[PDB]
Amino acid sequence: ASKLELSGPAEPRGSKSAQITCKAKGFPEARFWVFWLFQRAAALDWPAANFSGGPVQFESRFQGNASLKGSQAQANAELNIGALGSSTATYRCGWKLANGGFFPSWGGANVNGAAGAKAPAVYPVEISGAGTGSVTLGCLVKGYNAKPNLTWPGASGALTFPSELNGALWNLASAVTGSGFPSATCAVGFGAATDVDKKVAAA
Amino acid sequence: ALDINSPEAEKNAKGARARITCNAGNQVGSAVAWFNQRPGDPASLLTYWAATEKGVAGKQSAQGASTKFSMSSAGPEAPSLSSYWCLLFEKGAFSFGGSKLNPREGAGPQASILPPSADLNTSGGAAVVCFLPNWYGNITVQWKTEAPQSQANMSWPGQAGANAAYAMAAVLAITKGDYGPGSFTCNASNRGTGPFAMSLN
Amino acid sequence: SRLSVCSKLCYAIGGAPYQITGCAIGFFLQIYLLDVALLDPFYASIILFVGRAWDAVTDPTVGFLVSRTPWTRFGRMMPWIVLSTPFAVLCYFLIWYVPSVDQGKVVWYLIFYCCFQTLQTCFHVPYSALTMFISTEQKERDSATAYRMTVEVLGTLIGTAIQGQIVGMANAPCISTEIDLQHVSLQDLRNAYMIASGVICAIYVVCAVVLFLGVKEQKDTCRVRTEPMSFFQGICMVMGHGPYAKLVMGFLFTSLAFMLLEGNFALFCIYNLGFRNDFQNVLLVIMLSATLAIPFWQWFLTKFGKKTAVYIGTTSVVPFLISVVLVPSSLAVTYIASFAAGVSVAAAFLLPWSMLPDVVDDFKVQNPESQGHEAIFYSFYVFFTKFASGVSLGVSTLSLDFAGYVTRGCTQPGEVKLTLKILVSAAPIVLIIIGLLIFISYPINEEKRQGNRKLLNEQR
Numbered sequence: 001a002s003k004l005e006l007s008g009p010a011e012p013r014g015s016k017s018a019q020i021t022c023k024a025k026g027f028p029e030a031r032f033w034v035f036w037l038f039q040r041a042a043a044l045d046w047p048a049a050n051f052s053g054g055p056v057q058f059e060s061r062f063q064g065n066a067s068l069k070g071s072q073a074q075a076n077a078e079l080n081i082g083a084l085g086s087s088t089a090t091y092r093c094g095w096k097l098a099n100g101g102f103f104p105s106w107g108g109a110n111v112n113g114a115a116g117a118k119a120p121a122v123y124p125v126e127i128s129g130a131g132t133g134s135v136t137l138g139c140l141v142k143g144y145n146a147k148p149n150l151t152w153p154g155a156s157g158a159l160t161f162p163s164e165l166n167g168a169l170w171n172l173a174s175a176v177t178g179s180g181f182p183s184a185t186c187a188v189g190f191g192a193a194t195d196v197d198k199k200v201a202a203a
Numbered sequence: 204a205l206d207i208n209s210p211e212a213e214k215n216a217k218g219a220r221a222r223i224t225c226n227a228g229n230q231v232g233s234a235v236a237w238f239n240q241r242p243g244d245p246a247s248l249l250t251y252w253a254a255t256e257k258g259v260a261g262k263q264s265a266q267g268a269s270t271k272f273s274m275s276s277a278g279p280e281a282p283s284l285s286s287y288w289c290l291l292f293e294k295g296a297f298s299f300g301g302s303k304l305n306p307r308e309g310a311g312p313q314a315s316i317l318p319p320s321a322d323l324n325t326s327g328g329a330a331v332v333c334f335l336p337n338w339y340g341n342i343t344v345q346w347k348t349e350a351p352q353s354q355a356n357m358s359w360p361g362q363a364g365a366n367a368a369y370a371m372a373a374v375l376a377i378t379k380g381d382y383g384p385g386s387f388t389c390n391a392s393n394r395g396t397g398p399f400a401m402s403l404n
Numbered sequence: 405s406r407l408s409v410c411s412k413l414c415y416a417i418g419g420a421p422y423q424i425t426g427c428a429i430g431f432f433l434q435i436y437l438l439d440v441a442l443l444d445p446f447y448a449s450i451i452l453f454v455g456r457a458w459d460a461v462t463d464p465t466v467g468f469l470v471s472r473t474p475w476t477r478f479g480r481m482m483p484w485i486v487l488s489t490p491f492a493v494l495c496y497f498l499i500w501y502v503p504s505v506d507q508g509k510v511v512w513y514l515i516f517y518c519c520f521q522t523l524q525t526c527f528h529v530p531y532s533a534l535t536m537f538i539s540t541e542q543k544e545r546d547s548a549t550a551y552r553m554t555v556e557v558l559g560t561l562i563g564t565a566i567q568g569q570i571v572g573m574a575n576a577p578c579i580s581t582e583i584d585l586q587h588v589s590l591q592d593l594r595n596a597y598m599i600a601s602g603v604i605c606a607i608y609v610v611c612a613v614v615l616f617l618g619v620k621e622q623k624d625t626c627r628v629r630t631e632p633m634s635f636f637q638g639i640c641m642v643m644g645h646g647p648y649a650k651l652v653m654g655f656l657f658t659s660l661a662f663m664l665l666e667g668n669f670a671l672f673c674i675y676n677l678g679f680r681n682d683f684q685n686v687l688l689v690i691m692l693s694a695t696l697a698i699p700f701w702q703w704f705l706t707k708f709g710k711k712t713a714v715y716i717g718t719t720s721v722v723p724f725l726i727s728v729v730l731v732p733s734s735l736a737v738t739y740i741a742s743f744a745a746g747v748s749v750a751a752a753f754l755l756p757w758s759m760l761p762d763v764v765d766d767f768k769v770q771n772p773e774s775q776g777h778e779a780i781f782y783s784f785y786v787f788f789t790k791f792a793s794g795v796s797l798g799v800s801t802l803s804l805d806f807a808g809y810v811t812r813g814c815t816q817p818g819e820v821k822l823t824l825k826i827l828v829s830a831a832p833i834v835l836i837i838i839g840l841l842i843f844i845s846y847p848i849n850e851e852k853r854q855g856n857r858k859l860l861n862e863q864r
């Protein structure tokens with residue numbers, strides 16, 4: 001079957017250049033227009049398209065910001081992104097049916113144009129001296145530059161909010177609605193070491 | 204470039220039928236592609252030329268002549284509650300609109316305020332966290348340090364698989380020097396005909 | 405007790421729907437499926453190939469069924485026509501109908517195209533034997549055949565004019581693609597196709613009613629009914645003859661080249677010459693020139709012999725087929741080449757029928773025992789032309805799919821225009837050259853021996 005394998009996530013720094021590969025298989029790459037997209041948090045855009053045996057057609061917004069290339073000796077399409085800062089998005093690599101104009105087969109690769117790499121800080125936010133039946137405990141993870149995996153010791157009542165940008169670092173919160181409170185601890189992920197688990201005390 | 208769009212960015216449907224509408228800024232001549240995208244996955248082609256499926260379950264149909272198009276899912280299951288896009292292949296510059304389906308749940312919000320911990324207070328900071336774990340609809344959060352504030356960062360998850368309810372976390376970051384304004388209150392306004400206030404001193 | 409002129413005129417009028425529907429589904433089906441029905445050219449290739457290969461399949465089967473048809477109270481051929489026409493017009497209207505089907509419009513077009521080809525075979529095959537059934541004198545049959553051919557030419561012209569003007573009256577929007585990156589609607593175009601199909605179906609019916617009312621059957625019971633099982637033996641005997649096989653192969657290859665042009669010429673006019681507003685006027689000019697050039701080629705074959713006429717008539721289009729792809733799409737050059745292509749079409753589809761009696765006389769001289777040889781020749785030519793023209797159109801539309809033909813488009817990429825230039829300027833020239841080389845090996849050598857064979861026709 002026709003498939004398109006894209007590169008992994010990348011972390012350009014402000015004004016670098018990021019090159020994304022789109023190694024295709026299952027079809028002649030020189031016969032079809034290989035496209036590129038641009039997905040933000042929730043918006044689908046269109047940088048450009050490239051015919052592997054000829055021309056490249058861009059959007060007027062991405063002219064000079066994106067540069068497309070194609071290697072027919074390896075059937076690989078490359079997208080080169082110039083100056084960044086608001087280009088932290090997800091880039092897809094659809095191909096266009098040679099008759100219609102729609103995209104049957106797609107890829108997907110993340111680009112995160114930020115700077116810095118720090119260790120997360122864990123704060124056990126707790127109740128403020130009140131209780132009625134079920135009580136809400138919390139765990140605040142502040143100041144990191146990756147994707148962590150917050151967990152709890154065998155309790156499934158947790159809600160882990162999506163992380164947000166605060167300056168140049170990321171912030172995340174987790175909430176647990178627990179009935180009884182003998183002992184509860186917050187254990188975080190953050191695969192780049194810095195493993196820290198902190199108990200949640202009263203007051 | 205055309206200005207195709209999907210008006211409802213959110214829709215409520217449980218098991219009966221959904222009719223996602225797309226509107227085109229130009230007469231596209233029945234050239235509309237419909238994509239389905241699940242989170243963490245690329246957009247999958249459902250419909251092309253505004254009525255023709257591509258290896259998709261028979262519940263996904265689509266209608267529309269010009270500048271008014273619809274995709275009907277009359278059998279909406281758990282996989283069908285995803286994000287649906289409409290493309291157009293009439294003009295050179297291709298355009299999308301964005302939409303999403305959601306299940307229908309009751310109502311009833313809940314709020315809880317949490318003061319900064321001693322560890323954060325030691326390291327030159329104070330983040331007050333307001334949690335809104337279970338509610339349905341759209342909610343608004345206001346911070347009162349005896350006055351309204353506009354320095355808070357807010358985050359929302361999606362819809363829970365079991366409870367079918369949304370959540371919201373509001374973080375108010377205040378330094379130790381600015382940490383004497385009195386009492387801190389979190390106010391939530393929902394479809395409940397009254398705000399919920401949680402305060403600490 | 406001969407044929408009236410009104411009866412011959414009604415019989416001739418009855419043969420107009422076959423030519424009208426043939427010219428419609430020869431010139432415009434490839435436009436309609438690719439652009440108006442919004443089909444992938446792979447599926448349109450399948451539809452065209454199977455549609456023109458099922459007609460050739462159904463010709464001998466319907467012929468064998470007609471040969472076994474008993475005598476009814478209305479005749480042996482009139483019940484076939486009366487029971488075939490109301491379903492044939494329904495299937496023809498549903499050929500040019502774009503349904504609201506979520507998956508498999510190719511199945512709809514395949515089913516209704518094959519059904520219409522079967523019903524049109526069930527109409528035309530009894531209609532071919534109707535000229536034997538109407539009268540016993542050979543002069544009346546020849547007069548009916550001449551009337552039928554004249555109304556066949558006029559029916560081709562009338563059907564091309566009607567379908568072209570109606571479907572070119574309502575234009576439609578196009579698809580802008582990457583290539584083109586620096587009121588009317590598509591439903592109006594589909595309704596124009598439905599209106600043209602309704603007009604042609606009204607003509608079909610009217611002509612069916614005229615054929616039913618004006619033509620009797622005479623209850624012919626004379627001579628012998630030959631042998632239907634000897635069809636393969638007669639095919640082998642005809643193919644064993646030198647001049648007959650040479651005429652079969654030449655006419656075949658030449659008609660195959662012109663059917664390839666007829667198929668992939670509207671796309672060439674639209675997307676290479678940039679005449680999507682007036683592509684029907686080029687077809688009308690070609691058919692009008694072909695209608696007007698028939699007396700010219702009749703005078704030419706009556707004056708300058710038959711060998712030079714068939715040598716120059718098929719090859720006159722070759723410099724113009726070079727010229728249409730070797731000019732920057734000038735309007736007057738295309739119209740002059742359209743006039744020349746009409747003259748060449750008239751020559752190509754007129755001259756071998758003039759060559760045929762010189763081969764019939766030679767087959768009479770060589771084989772004294774002959775029964776249905778001309779009918780066998782006509783059936784073989786019809787079957788192979790329809791089947792190989794279906795192969796050619798399927799390969800052409802599949803090549804358009806492989807070249808990246810955009811559905812509609814206002815333009816085509818550099819591969820599709822090259823394939824269309826090859827399909828109107830390389831493959832027709834190669835097939836015409838093959839037919840000319842086959843016609844070179846002609847041992848009859850025009851009348852120079854054939855009249856001597858006619859002398860032996862006086863001997864036997």
Ligand SMILES: CCCCCCCCCCCCO[C@@H]1O[C@H](CO)[C@@H](O[C@H]2O[C@H](CO)[C@@H](O)[C@H](O)[C@H]2O)[C@H](O)[C@H]1O
Nearest residue numbers: 097100103104105248251257258444446447450453454
């Ligand atoms: C006997 C007559 C000749 C018959 C030859 C044998 C063919 C039998 C039918 C096979 C048809 C399927 O063959 C092929 O399958 C793929 C499946 O994705 C279809 O799909 C292809 O086009 C569609 C759009 O039209 C794209 O969305 C898709 O990405 C592409 O793969 C093609 O439309 C078809 O060309």
Ligand SMILES: CCCCCCCCCCCCO[C@@H]1O[C@H](CO)[C@@H](O[C@H]2O[C@H](CO)[C@@H](O)[C@H](O)[C@H]2O)[C@H](O)[C@H]1O
Nearest residue numbers: 406407408409410411412413414416417420555558614
């Ligand atoms: C588009 C086609 C329809 C156009 C409108 C119809 C016009 C043609 C109708 C047929 C005319 C012939 O109809 C009738 O035929 C007989 C012979 O059979 C004629 O009888 C005589 O008339 C003419 C010459 O004068 C000759 O055709 C014929 O040789 C002769 O016998 C009658 O005078 C005529 O009335």
Ligand SMILES: CCCCCCCCCCCCO[C@@H]1O[C@H](CO)[C@@H](O[C@H]2O[C@H](CO)[C@@H](O)[C@H](O)[C@H]2O)[C@H](O)[C@H]1O
Nearest residue numbers: 406407408409410412413543544547548551554555558
């Ligand atoms: C769009 C225009 C359509 C063409 C015109 C409308 C059709 C009208 C019928 C054809 C024209 C008149 O009909 C013409 O009459 C003459 C005689 O007068 C006929 O001539 C013949 O008629 C009959 C035929 O067996 C015989 O008497 C005889 O062999 C001869 O006279 C022509 O065969 C015919 O062409």
Ligand SMILES: CCCCCCCCCCCCO[C@@H]1O[C@H](CO)[C@@H](O[C@H]2O[C@H](CO)[C@@H](O)[C@H](O)[C@H]2O)[C@H](O)[C@H]1O
Nearest residue numbers: 408409410411413414417418420562607610611614618
């Ligand atoms: C798209 C095609 C449109 C088709 C439209 C229908 C046209 C059909 C053409 C024939 C029309 C009828 O033609 C009719 O033929 C008969 C033939 O006997 C003629 O009838 C005439 O012929 C006889 C001949 O002996 C004469 O004695 C007598 O004067 C008269 O009865 C009619 O005068 C003529 O009107």
Ligand SMILES: CCCCCCCCCCCCO[C@@H]1O[C@H](CO)[C@@H](O[C@H]2O[C@H](CO)[C@@H](O)[C@H](O)[C@H]2O)[C@H](O)[C@H]1O
Nearest residue numbers: 493494497498501502503504505506507601602605606
């Ligand atoms: C000579 C002119 C007069 C002709 C008179 C008849 C003309 C009728 C106009 C065409 C109407 C038919 O319209 C067409 O019918 C078929 C069968 O009902 C429908 O086809 C339907 O059935 C099939 C098989 O169950 C499924 O794919 C699906 O349920 C649906 O597509 C088409 O969606 C519709 O587009």
Ligand SMILES: CCCCCCCCCCCCO[C@@H]1O[C@H](CO)[C@@H](O[C@H]2O[C@H](CO)[C@@H](O)[C@H](O)[C@H]2O)[C@H](O)[C@H]1O
Nearest residue numbers: 261447450454458505506507508509510511512514518
């Ligand atoms: C004379 C023999 C002709 C042989 C030529 C080659 C075979 C025919 C070529 C086209 C076959 C396409 O294959 C066909 O395509 C479409 C979807 O792609 C589907 O076609 C089906 O779709 C829906 C399914 O409810 C229905 O309207 C209907 O049953 C049928 O049209 C079938 O899943 C598949 O059987």
Ligand SMILES: CCCCCCCCCCCCO[C@@H]1O[C@H](CO)[C@@H](O[C@H]2O[C@H](CO)[C@@H](O)[C@H](O)[C@H]2O)[C@H](O)[C@H]1O
Nearest residue numbers: 413416417420543546547548550551554555558559562
């Ligand atoms: C959509 C349908 C449009 C309707 C078109 C109606 C137009 C009808 C055209 C009338 C044809 C005129 O037919 C005229 O008459 C005589 C019959 O006597 C025909 O026949 C004549 O030529 C043939 C040639 O082999 C010989 O048999 C003989 O010389 C003579 O009978 C001629 O073909 C023509 O000269």
Ligand SMILES: CCCCCCCCCCCCO[C@@H]1O[C@H](CO)[C@@H](O[C@H]2O[C@H](CO)[C@@H](O)[C@H](O)[C@H]2O)[C@H](O)[C@H]1O
Nearest residue numbers: 546550551553554555558695698699702703706757758
């Ligand atoms: C523009 C309005 C619509 C068109 C109207 C046209 C009406 C006139 C054309 C009707 C058909 C004419 O038919 C004409 O008949 C004469 C005989 O009389 C033929 O004359 C000759 O041709 C045939 C071969 O074809 C030979 O058998 C023989 O040498 C001779 O009969 C003409 O080649 C033929 O063209």
Ligand SMILES: CCCCCCCCCCCCO[C@@H]1O[C@H](CO)[C@@H](O[C@H]2O[C@H](CO)[C@@H](O)[C@H](O)[C@H]2O)[C@H](O)[C@H]1O
Nearest residue numbers: 561562563565566567568569570572573574681682685
């Ligand atoms: C002898 C050949 C003619 C006999 C067959 C009769 C066909 C005559 C045309 C049939 C269709 C009639 O309806 C047709 O509609 C369109 C508009 O809607 C118009 O057709 C128009 O198209 C072209 C397009 O460039 C114009 O240049 C032109 O002014 C006009 O012919 C006419 O109104 C009519 O030609």
Ligand SMILES: CCCCCCCCCCCCO[C@@H]1O[C@H](CO)[C@@H](O[C@H]2O[C@H](CO)[C@@H](O)[C@H](O)[C@H]2O)[C@H](O)[C@H]1O
Nearest residue numbers: 562566570573574575591592593595596599600603607
């Ligand atoms: C030989 C006998 C037969 C001769 C040919 C038949 C007579 C001429 C054909 C008449 C019908 C074709 O002419 C057609 O009619 C309709 C009705 O007004 C008109 O067409 C109309 O419908 C189409 C489809 O929505 C749209 O483009 C628009 O609404 C309008 O143009 C045009 O005029 C012409 O497209």
Ligand SMILES: CCCCCCCCCCCCO[C@@H]1O[C@H](CO)[C@@H](O[C@H]2O[C@H](CO)[C@@H](O)[C@H](O)[C@H]2O)[C@H](O)[C@H]1O
Nearest residue numbers: 267268497502503504591595598599600601602603606
């Ligand atoms: C002499 C004129 C001959 C006209 C054709 C005569 C055949 C009569 C039988 C079929 C009638 C027409 O067939 C019918 O036409 C209408 C347009 O008018 C088509 O269109 C219909 O469906 C489409 C779907 O989007 C709608 O946009 C449109 O508003 C609606 O009218 C139908 O799909 C078709 O079923």
Ligand SMILES: CCCCCCCCCCCCO[C@@H]1O[C@H](CO)[C@@H](O[C@H]2O[C@H](CO)[C@@H](O)[C@H](O)[C@H]2O)[C@H](O)[C@H]1O
Nearest residue numbers: 053792795796799800803807818819822823826827831
């Ligand atoms: C029974 C008789 C059958 C007769 C049917 C006639 C069919 C004729 C088929 C014509 C197909 C032409 O095929 C066309 O030729 C050119 C040049 O060779 C080629 O296309 C070329 O252009 C592209 C540029 O984008 C290059 O990658 C490369 O040089 C080549 O692929 C392809 O092969 C095809 O696009």
Ligand SMILES: CCCCCCCCCCCCO[C@@H]1O[C@H](CO)[C@@H](O[C@H]2O[C@H](CO)[C@@H](O)[C@H](O)[C@H]2O)[C@H](O)[C@H]1O
Nearest residue numbers: 053725726729730818819822825826827829830833834
């Ligand atoms: C036998 C009679 C010959 C008459 C003409 C027959 C048609 C064949 C020639 C059609 C003209 C176009 O033919 C074509 O033109 C272009 C430039 O315009 C040439 O140049 C092309 O070569 C390369 C091949 O990879 C293409 O990628 C590119 O599109 C183009 O630069 C081709 O070499 C020629 O094949």
